[PDB]
Amino acid sequence: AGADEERAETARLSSFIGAIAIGDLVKSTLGPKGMDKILLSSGRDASLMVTNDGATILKNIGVDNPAAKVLVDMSRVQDDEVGDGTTSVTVLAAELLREAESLIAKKIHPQTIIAGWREATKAARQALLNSAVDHGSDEVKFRQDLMNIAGTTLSSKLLTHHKDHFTKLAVEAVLRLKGSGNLEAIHVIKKLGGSLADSYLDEGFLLDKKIGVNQPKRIENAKILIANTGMDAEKEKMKEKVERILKHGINCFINRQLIYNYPEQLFGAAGVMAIEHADFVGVERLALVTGGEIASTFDHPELVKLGSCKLIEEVMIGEDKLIHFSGVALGEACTIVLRGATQQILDEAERSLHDALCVLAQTVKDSRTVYGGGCSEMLMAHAVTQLASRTPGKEAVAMESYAKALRMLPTIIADNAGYDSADLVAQLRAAHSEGKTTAGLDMKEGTIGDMSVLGITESFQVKRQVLLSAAEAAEVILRVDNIIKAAPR
Amino acid sequence: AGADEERAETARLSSFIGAIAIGDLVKSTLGPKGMDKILLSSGRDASLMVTNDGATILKNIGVDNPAAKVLVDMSRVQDDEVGDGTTSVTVLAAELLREAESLIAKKIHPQTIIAGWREATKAARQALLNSAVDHGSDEVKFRQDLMNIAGTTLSSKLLTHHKDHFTKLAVEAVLRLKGSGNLEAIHVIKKLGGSLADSYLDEGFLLDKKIGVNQPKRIENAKILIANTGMDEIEHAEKEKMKEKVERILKHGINCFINRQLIYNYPEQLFGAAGVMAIEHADFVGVERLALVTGGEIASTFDHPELVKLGSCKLIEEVMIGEDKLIHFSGVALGEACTIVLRGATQQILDEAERSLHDALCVLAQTVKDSRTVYGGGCSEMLMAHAVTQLASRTPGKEAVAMESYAKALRMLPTIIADNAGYDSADLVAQLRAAHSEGKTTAGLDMKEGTIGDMSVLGITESFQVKRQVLLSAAEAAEVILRVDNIIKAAPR
Amino acid sequence: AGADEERAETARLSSFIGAIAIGDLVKSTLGPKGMDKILLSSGRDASLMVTNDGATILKNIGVDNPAAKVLVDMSRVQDDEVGDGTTSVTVLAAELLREAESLIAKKIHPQTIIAGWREATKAARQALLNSAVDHGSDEVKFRQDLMNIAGTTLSSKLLTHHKDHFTKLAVEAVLRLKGSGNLEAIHVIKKLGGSLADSYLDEGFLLDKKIGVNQPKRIENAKILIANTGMDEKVERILKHGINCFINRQLIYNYPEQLFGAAGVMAIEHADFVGVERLALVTGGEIASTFDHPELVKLGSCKLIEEVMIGEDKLIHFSGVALGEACTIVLRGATQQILDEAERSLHDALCVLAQTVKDSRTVYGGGCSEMLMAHAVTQLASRTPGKEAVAMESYAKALRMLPTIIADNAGYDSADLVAQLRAAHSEGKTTAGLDMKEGTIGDMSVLGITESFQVKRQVLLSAAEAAEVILRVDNIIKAAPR
Amino acid sequence: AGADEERAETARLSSFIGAIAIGDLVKSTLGPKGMDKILLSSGRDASLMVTNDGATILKNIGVDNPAAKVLVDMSRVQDDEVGDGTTSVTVLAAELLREAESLIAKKIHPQTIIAGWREATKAARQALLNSAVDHGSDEVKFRQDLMNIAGTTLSSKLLTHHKDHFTKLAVEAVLRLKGSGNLCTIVLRGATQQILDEAERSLHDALCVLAQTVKDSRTVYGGGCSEMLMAHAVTQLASRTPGKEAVAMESYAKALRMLPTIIADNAGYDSADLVAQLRAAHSEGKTTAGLDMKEGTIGDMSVLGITESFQVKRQVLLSAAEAAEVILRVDNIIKAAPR
């Protein structure tokens, strides 16, 4: 075992230290004034690596004994099925830990303070609910689809000089997949070969493989075959495969594993295009697209198999050969595909398309967003301060401490702008109090202005996940009983 | 230089340390201000686990060299006879060891001390189950059906602001469950909006699942099918799996199919045309209880229908719950098994109700079996303390010495309840003892008040087994530690 | 390593330390309220072993350089010709050494002090002089066989609620074990089925194995064959012998198995070697080699061998045996922690009872022998010559501690007990002794506690006689390499 | 430590120290009250062993670095022709070394002193005449067959209480051994191993003494009677010889005095009270009178019947001078290159 045993105030402190270290590095990364960062490390890194996105660097390395790594791990789940935009979820969570020093003065027990979280719901819910922020997102929508939040996600990243346009393309992908929950079957690739727009949109799925030097280049009214088992007396295997194949009219074969050489000669003459070691992730997503099939042994063809017969072909779009799957009857799942100029910046586009894709799917379906530039946060602060006075006995302590926390956010945005935040903090406060949700910190202005004109909106999901996760972590470690061994691993 | 052997006083200490280590962690769990805790481990442990229940976490891990794992193992037999109540059995065992420091100055004989346990054989029979306390817990009971023990188990959870009313309902469910076939038949769900009352009772089982958009709205004279295995010549075989399902199905009159896992697409089309309602990926916890409810079935392969399946036949439908529509299973022949649905007042988790469901009836099965109870909130505890003082005096010489020390132990329990409250502990002890001394069994510790109050009004009462089984548990593993005094030799320095 | 060099004062001290260390552990063990203990070691030891019987743990372990193991080794000789009842032999010998401190003060000739050992024969008289005990034990004894001393060995042990019946069974084992066949061939095991009797007695040797489902039910005028080499020609000369049963210690070849069934011969697969070695003594033996082994080279006793269902499982019984030296008992029981401990008691019971029959004498237990013994010896130190007397009087006060230990483990006050105890014994009642349940003094005979006369004789012969050599020795015991 | 190489004053000491170390264990062996002594060893040794006879235990093992094992080896050849009585050859040989402390102060040729051994031949002849020898014997002999010297050999042994009886038994064995043949089976009681075979070698000594008693035709009074008489006469002898002869004469004579002292002490009576009375009776002319240990004084040895074989006394006298003589003449036992 390891047996590192935590005692009262020396338990709370480890959580406290982890939060402060993360906040300074992540703070400069936010929005339009976001910045790239580089890292050099001990062990096997041997050099300085630069990642604009905070989440990618945190998972790669677990530097020291206090455990902040687990808090870090959670952000990815957010990133794959929602996620990023700007990194603020970690920052807000960290700031709530500072107040705990104040809490020892209270000196009862942390759990009584925990009442703040029920009220975190009441104070915050009013805050998200202070309204405007979201235009409404009617459904698909002609121009509100983008030139908003995806563009800002890109803003912290340099590729935005010509990649603002790439971001615009991504919303089209989310609109066609709306309904039945969210994200499944979305993938993106980039091709070396320049164009001003830097992109091509495929109505189907993009795969990078070829059967061999021989085989028909284009297939029509294609049938798709997926096998759980590889192709690998021998002639009898050859004979079974040919007999079943001709009747179906099979135009393409996709198998997720190693493929045997004998069938390959047959596929070329037959007029059937096969793919060696096709990636499973593409196949499962593809299956929703083609209606799928139950993949068994060679008995698999015809009815137990369901293929989509619109158009499959391998297309030279520039340099590297790719295969285009097109014509999804289901309509539920689609891809996108990207082009470039042949630059380091282009590979960065790959980095941010994922960033763009996740935000919009959630933005459209949740039917909510918040005003950026701290508009939502200052307004939230004004509403919460009166709330503490309103609440009774056990209610009126937890909520009050939470309320002053919101004050710091306006201050952080003003400084990164460069203007004096002291003037800024209450000049800002007066505008939110007045009733303009659209008003907030304008970094470009240097004072306060209209956020809505700017076009910065934050996904409603990015804001709820951050606030709930912020202190749940704080309360769990202090409580910890009979800790066992050590190290997250 | 190795051996790992130790001298008289030191040997006693290794056992002594184990009791103190466990007591502080279990300490936070007790009473209304109880806390949830997390653990991390290496070596066939996946991730952090948090267990509200003290017994579950102790069973899973053999943490270190000191002896205490066997002490821990015993609590499970207790969590069979009755259950968790509120964890406290482990705490009492630990305090037994503190006096031992005093015992060095006892100046007589440690083996002689062992005779106290012999005394305890007839002492766990005296103070325990032979004192005053309440007049309650025989079958049914109208006024004291609840407004009792559910509230104390519930006390550890802060939701008790409205939750205590929720706990009131729980015994009505227990009364119907009494009979043959111990326990597993109860399910509960929470809702996102509602009234001051905060909860409703439904005649049948509550579920939030649907086969698909298509299928008949309602079924009568319903037959229920439960399958362990999912629905998920070979090309023809799919047609045949489809054929076996319909052939067996039509003769029975199959009204509803419930499967605990993923369901194959081919059957779905069949069920819609047939007029059969099925549930995809229904969770296991609802299923085991439902089986007890219907009359059971043997869940095997597709042969599962007809005789091997027993199905109740009143009404299965999706219906009326205030804001959310759920599928109601009702009119079951057993009647032993029934459901308290509840609805949510609206606080963050409110998933609390699912945990409280389990809490409500397991304790109660023993309630009919014991025909007896005690008053919770430490009411019994101060009363026993005042009463046990007399008991030590009753037994002469050797017999009294083990018994009086035990009596002062009861004093701490009132204090621990006070401690989680946030009120000053010293004040609490004075006020508490006088009320009990007077002769009023109902009076107890009111934590919100900070003083003593009527326990019955809040509720909190304890089942008779929870109070007789626990002391025996306290005396577990502790006895193996010091009844035998032999650890061997010394080889200088 | 050579011979360890110690002289005068220092040499004596090493002997002195060994006796005190052993006495404290053995002390809690004695009597009805004795204690079970657990020991942990390293190297060739697995985990924890618990033995109520003091002799078993001492034989197993020779932990360190100081002298004591040869003394310990001797107790086994004591067991063969009695040894047990309850452990007490080690305790009395140890207290002998405390007096040696007073010896330096005498400052003359420690060897003349040895003459006190001459007085040891008087001790053999006097220690047991203290009033009459028993006198019959004719041989076999239909009623006087048990229901006294065996129970006492068991009383310390937890199992006594039903065990006392099992102990009773053990005398039967001793009766067949009398004479000089050596102390060998006694086999005991426990079984899962439950009954009030809690045990069974078999006239022969028990083995738990079967050839296979096919084969005859029983054999008569049986011939027994044991082979060293595995089965992995047989029928033609097997028929000649008339072979009724074959026992092999290892894996058995399948082909002969079909043949044995038709012939009418029952064979045993993977028979344990330990059972086999004893069996050879039993049947006159044979010489085991290759398949040439049958006929005259093989000797087989011919009573009858059969397989009998005990009640819960199938067992095979070997009985008769012309030679007669070796016999077996098969035990079974109610199924308790207490049943497992039945193993503890039979080993103890066989030896206690075996000497009960040929000892001719027993003593009153519960400290009765010890208090009275103290009273008689005190008068004599004054009567005997000076220095030998000095050793003799000190020895007398040693007996005092035993009364104190028995009362103390019962939870009653040791001080009060000593005063009242001595007056009873002093008066002249042989029967009166310490009643732990009572907390005072009472009649030992009603309890039924008695001790074998020789258990008492070799606790003191080792303390005495041999102790002539203790001061004499100078350099003691170790190992026995490889 | 740091490489040992001892010379003159401390080199002499190593021979000296070996003799004193051996003497303490063996001294208790002599006289009617003696110590049985048992030894247990490591490496192919199984149990504690008991051997009263000093000579064999020394033969069995070579315990330490100082020289003495070769001296020890020699005592066995003594055993072959006579052997025991009591083990006095090793202690008396060692006895001569204590006096050497006096010699350093003498500071005049230690070597001249050594020549005394040559003159010990004169001392050996002195011992004859002095010895106090009886008549009797009469071949076979109904009552004087034993309860004598064997008893003396065994007096020392603790087991004298029971054993003096079986010492008596051994002369019966010697009576059957007489007649045309020179030098049946007897069973003893003991511990267990090879060391038990020590008894065969150790009791070799008892058989021979008795055998000599039947064909010696001569024996001497036991219980120390022989020793005091010889002592009174030898004092005269130094005075009776020329000064070169006399120095090795007179020193040898006082050695005899210690034997009376050891005999009386083990009895249980004051050691020196006995010395006064003992000398007076021998001086008078009664060869029969000697040390009566149970009495604590002096008495008639003949009534006791205790007698020592003429051969035991004859050979010891010759053997003591020859064994002691070689040690002074020879170096320190080492040198000659390659270690």
Handedness of CA A290, A292, A293, A296 (dihedral sign): positive
Look up residue A41 and give its DSSP letter. Answer: -
Q: What is d(CA C216, CA C222) in angstroms, rounded to the nearest whole number? A: 13
- Which residues have a C–N gap over 2.5 Å right after them in chain A? 232
Specify burial of residue A469 (Cβ count, 10 A radius: 0-12, 13-18, 19+).
Answer: middle
| Per-residue tokens: B314 | 């009143």
Handedness of CA D68, D73, D74, D76 (dihedral sign): positive
Contact by Cβ (8 Å): D336, D327: no
Contact by Cβ (8 Å): B20, B93: no
Residues of chain C with CATH 3.50.7.10: 203-324
| Per-residue tokens: A209 | 């493989």
Using the structure block, give the residue that is written with the tokens 């013994």. Answer: C373
How far is the CA of A176 from the CAs of A183, B289, C34, C168, in angstroms? Answer: 11, 43, 84, 91
Q: What is d(CA C175, CA C173) in angstroms, rounded to the nearest whole number? A: 6
Look up residue B89 and give its DSSP letter. Answer: H
Q: Nearest-CA neighbor of B191 among B179, B202, B199?
A: B199
- The minimum CA-CA distance between C280 and chain D, rounded to whole Å, is 29
Most B CBs within 10 Å, among A106, A475, A481, to test the B interface? A481
- According to DSSP, the β-strands at A322-326 and A311-315 are antiparallel
Which residues are CB-neighbours of B140 under 8 A, at least 6 positions away?
Answer: B175
Chain-chain contact of C473 with D37 (C-beta, under 8 angstroms): yes
Q: Which fold has domain C134-202+325-360?
A: GROEL; domain 2 (3.30.260)
For chain B, first and last CA: distance in Å? 11
Handedness of CA D135, D137, D141, D144 (dihedral sign): positive
Beta-bridge partners for C298? C286
Buried b or exposed e, range C440-450, using 16+ CB within 10 angstroms: ebbbbbebebb
What is the Cα D104 distance to its own chain's centre?
28
| Per-residue tokens: A205 | 């799925």
How far is the CA of C165 from the CAs of C86, C171, C320, C343, D63, in angstroms? Answer: 18, 11, 26, 14, 58
Using the structure block, give the residue that is written with the tokens 């009220």. Answer: A119
Which residues are CB-neighbours of C234 under 8 A, at least 6 positions away?
Answer: C256, C259, C291
Say which CATH superfamily domain A1-133+368-489 falls into.
GroEL-like equatorial domain (1.10.560.10)
B161: Cα within 13 Å, side-chain hemisphere: 12
What is the Cα A260 distance to its own chain's centre?
39
Beta-bridge partners for C315? C308
| Per-residue tokens: B408 | 């002062």
For chain A, first and last CA: distance in Å? 14
Beta-bridge partners for A340? A194
| Per-residue tokens: A420 | 């004096």
What is the Cα A371 distance to its own chain's centre?
19
Q: How was this structure determined?
A: cryo-EM
3-state helix, strand, coil in chain B (%, to 5): 45, 10, 45
What is the CATH number assigned to the segment(s) A134-202+332-367? Answer: 3.30.260.10
Q: What is d(CA A332, CA A358) in angstroms, rounded to the nearest whole number? A: 16
Chain-chain contact of B39 with A70 (C-beta, under 8 angstroms): no
Name the H helices within B371-424.
Answer: 379-394, 398-421
| Per-residue tokens: C240 | 């000649």
Q: Nearest-CA neighbor of D141 among D84, D225, D205, D219?
A: D219
Chain-chain contact of C473 with D39 (C-beta, under 8 angstroms): yes
Using the structure block, give the residue that is written with the tokens 């809505």. Answer: A452
Residues from chain D contacting residue C481 (CB–CB below 8 Å)? 43-44
Chain-chain contact of B28 with A479 (C-beta, under 8 angstroms): yes
Residue B451: phi, psi to the nearest 5? -130, -165
| Other Cβ atoms closer than 10 A to D59 | 18
What is the Cα B380 distance to its own chain's centre?
20
Q: Determine the 3-state secondary structure of C100 from DSSP.
A: helix
Residue D282: phi, psi to the nearest 5? -70, -40
| Per-residue tokens: A167 | 């971001």
Q: What is d(CA C326, CA C276) in angstroms, rounded to the nearest whole number? A: 12
Using the structure block, give the residue that is written with the tokens 């040690």. Answer: D327
CATH tag for B134-202+336-371 (out of 3.40.440.10, 3.30.260.10, 3.40.1390.10, 3.40.1130.10):
3.30.260.10
* Rg of chain D on CA atoms, in Å: 21
- Which class does domain C203-324 fall in? alpha beta
Amino acid letter at C372?
L
Which residues are CB-neighbours of B33 under 8 A, at least 6 positions away?
Answer: A109, A111, A112, B156, B158, B420, B421, B422, B447
Contact by Cβ (8 Å): B298, B306: no
Asked if chain A contacts chain D via 3 or more Cβ pairs within 8 Å, the reply is: no
Using the structure block, give the residue that is written with the tokens 């935009």. Answer: A85
Handedness of CA B128, B133, B134, B135 (dihedral sign): positive
Residues of chain B with CATH 3.30.260.10: 134-202+336-371
Chain-chain contact of B484 with C21 (C-beta, under 8 angstroms): no
Q: What is d(CA C291, CA C268) in angstroms, rounded to the nearest whole number? A: 16
Which residues are CB-neighbours of A187 under 8 A, at least 6 positions away?
Answer: A205, A206, A281, A282, A285, A335, A336
- The minimum CA-CA distance between B328 and chain A, rounded to whole Å, is 25
Residues of chain D with CATH 3.30.260.10: 134-217
SS3 letters for D82-144? CCCCCCCHHHHHHHHHHHHHHHHHHCCCHHHHHHHHHCHHHHHHHHHHHCCECCCCCCCCCCC
Buried b or exposed e, range C128-139, using 16+ CB within 10 angstroms: bebbebbeebee
Strand order through the sheet with C205-207: C205-207, C314-319, C304-309, C218-220
Specify burial of residue C48 (Cβ count, 10 A radius: 0-12, 13-18, 19+).
Answer: exposed
Look up residue C298 and give its DSSP letter. Answer: B
Q: Is A204 annotated as a binding residue?
A: no
Q: Is A181 annotated as a binding residue?
A: no
Contact by Cβ (8 Å): B367, B448: no
Q: Determine the 3-state secondary structure of A441 from DSSP.
A: strand
Contact by Cβ (8 Å): C94, C12: no
What is the Cα D4 distance to its own chain's centre?
34
| Other Cβ atoms closer than 10 A to C269 | 16
The long-range contacts involving C395-402, CB below 8 angstroms and separated by at least 24 positions, are C395/C96, C395/C99, C395/C116, C395/C123, C398/C92, C398/C95, C398/C96, C398/C98, C399/C370, C399/C371, C399/C373, C399/C374, C400/C370, C400/C371, C400/C374, C401/C95, C402/C88, C402/C91, C402/C367, C402/C370
What is the Cα B69 distance to its own chain's centre?
21
Q: What is d(CA D272, CA B97) in angstroms, rounded to the nearest whole number? A: 70
User: What is the DSSP secondary-structure string of C375-395?
Assistant: HHHHHHHHHS-HHHHHHHHHH
How far is the CA of C417 from the CAs of B356, C367, C404, in angstroms? Answer: 60, 12, 8
Q: What is d(CA B425, CA B420) in angstroms, rounded to the nearest whole number? A: 9
Helix (H) or strand (E) holding D24: helix D8-27
Which residues are CB-neighbours of B183 under 8 A, at least 6 positions away?
Answer: B177, B361, B362, B365
Listed resolution, Å? 10.5
Q: Which of A29, A79, A86, A198 is catalytic?
A: A86
Q: What is d(CA B434, CA B382) in angstroms, rounded to the nearest whole number? A: 9
How far is the CA of D288 from the CAs of D135, D140, D150, D227, D269, in angstroms? Answer: 11, 22, 18, 12, 21
Using the structure block, give the residue that is written with the tokens 């009566």. Answer: D292
Q: Determine the 3-state secondary structure of B318 from DSSP.
A: strand
Using the structure block, give the residue that is written with the tokens 């002898």. Answer: D237
Q: Is B9 annotated as a binding residue?
A: no
Beta-bridge partners for C434? C441
Sequence-ordered strand ranges (E) for C169-214: 205-207
Residues of chain C with CATH 1.10.560.10: 1-133+361-482
What is the Cα C296 distance to its own chain's centre?
39
Q: What is d(CA C463, CA C469) in angstroms, rounded to the nearest whole number? A: 11
Contact by Cβ (8 Å): D36, D202: no
Contact by Cβ (8 Å): A95, A27: no
Look up residue C3 and give its DSSP letter. Answer: P
| Per-residue tokens: D79 | 């055993």
Helix (H) or strand (E) holding D13: helix D8-27
Q: Is A87 annotated as a binding residue?
A: yes
Residues from chain B contacting residue C35 (CB–CB below 8 Å)? 111, 483-486
Q: Nearest-CA neighbor of B339 among B149, B140, B165, B189?
A: B189
Which residues are CB-neighbours of B233 under 8 A, at least 6 positions away?
Answer: A299
User: What is the DSSP secondary-structure string of D156-188?
Assistant: SSTTHHHHHHHHHHHHHHHHHH-SSS-------
Would you tell me the crossing angle of helices D110-118 and D310-329 to the nearest 10 degrees?
150
Q: Nearest-CA neighbor of A14 among A97, A129, A124, A99?
A: A97
For chain C, first and last CA: distance in Å? 15
| Per-residue tokens: D234 | 């030898």
Contact by Cβ (8 Å): B297, B226: yes
* Rg of chain A on CA atoms, in Å: 27
Amino acid letter at C246?
F
B95: Cα within 13 Å, side-chain hemisphere: 20
Q: What is d(CA D132, CA D228) in angstroms, rounded to the nearest whole number? A: 10
Q: What is d(CA B84, CA B359) in angstroms, rounded to the nearest whole number? A: 9
Name the H helices within B179-263.
Answer: 234-252
Q: What is d(CA B262, CA B278) in angstroms, rounded to the nearest whole number? A: 12
Q: What is d(CA A318, CA A302) in angstroms, rounded to the nearest whole number? A: 36
Contact by Cβ (8 Å): D89, D323: yes
CATH tag for D134-217 (out of 3.30.260.10, 2.30.110.10, 1.20.120.550, 3.60.15.10):
3.30.260.10
Amino acid letter at B406?
Y
What is the Cα B493 distance to its own chain's centre?
51
Q: Which of A29, A53, A167, A442 is catalytic?
A: A53
Which residues are CB-neighbours of A254 under 8 A, at least 6 positions away?
Answer: A224, A225, A226, A274, A275, A278, A283, A286
- Number of helices and strands in chain B (H, E): 17, 13
From the list C112, C468, C478, which residue is nearest D42 (CB)?
C478
How far is the CA of A291 from the CAs of A54, A222, A230, A279, in angstroms? Answer: 38, 14, 22, 18
- Which class does domain D1-133+218-339 fall in? mainly alpha
| Per-residue tokens: D91 | 């202690």
| Per-residue tokens: A132 | 């405007």
Q: What is d(CA B278, CA B327) in angstroms, rounded to the nearest whole number? A: 11
Q: Determine the 3-state secondary structure of A466 from DSSP.
A: helix
- According to DSSP, the β-strands at B373-375 and B461-463 are antiparallel
Q: What is d(CA D78, CA C480) in angstroms, rounded to the nearest whole number? A: 35
Q: Determine the 3-state secondary structure of D336 from DSSP.
A: coil
Using the structure block, give the residue that is written with the tokens 């299923």. Answer: B287
Name the H helices within D181-309.
Answer: 197-202, 204-216, 225-239, 243-267, 271-284, 301-304
Contact by Cβ (8 Å): A163, A345: yes
Look up residue D189 and give its DSSP letter. Answer: -
Q: What is d(CA B330, CA B294) in angstroms, rounded to the nearest whole number? A: 10
Beta-bridge partners for A227? A255
Is A53 among the residues known to form the active site?
yes
Is A86 among the residues known to form the active site?
yes
Q: What is d(CA A165, CA A161) in angstroms, rounded to the nearest whole number? A: 9
Residue D205: phi, psi to the nearest 5? -60, -40
Q: Which fold has domain C1-133+361-482?
A: GROEL; domain 1 (1.10.560)
Residues of chain D with CATH 1.10.560.10: 1-133+218-339
Q: Determine the 3-state secondary structure of A260 from DSSP.
A: coil
Using the structure block, give the residue that is written with the tokens 């009242």. Answer: C420
Q: What is d(CA D49, CA A299) in angstroms, rounded to the nearest whole number? A: 90
Most B CBs within 10 Å, among A306, A399, A484, to test the B interface? A484
- Number of helices and strands in chain A (H, E): 18, 15
How far is the CA of A186 from the CAs of A30, A266, B270, in angstroms? Answer: 26, 33, 32
Q: What is d(CA D134, CA D127) in angstroms, rounded to the nearest whole number? A: 15
Chain-chain contact of B57 with A485 (C-beta, under 8 angstroms): no
Q: What is d(CA B224, CA B289) in angstroms, rounded to the nearest whole number? A: 13
What is the CATH number assigned to the segment(s) A203-331? Answer: 3.50.7.10
Would you tell me the crossing angle of helices D271-284 and D243-267 to the nearest 10 degrees?
120
Contact by Cβ (8 Å): D140, D175: yes
| Per-residue tokens: B423 | 């009120």
Q: Confirm or reject CATH 3.50.7.10 for domain B203-335, answering yes or no.
A: yes
Contact by Cβ (8 Å): C55, C87: yes
CATH tag for B1-133+372-493 (out of 2.40.50.140, 1.10.560.10, 1.10.10.1800, 3.40.50.1580):
1.10.560.10
Residues of chain B with CATH 3.50.7.10: 203-335
Q: What is d(CA C50, CA C72) in angstroms, rounded to the nearest whole number? A: 18
Q: Nearest-CA neighbor of A111 among B450, B37, B426, B458?
A: B37
From the list C28, C63, C411, which residue is nearest B398 (CB)?
C411
Using the structure block, give the residue that is written with the tokens 């035991």. Answer: D312
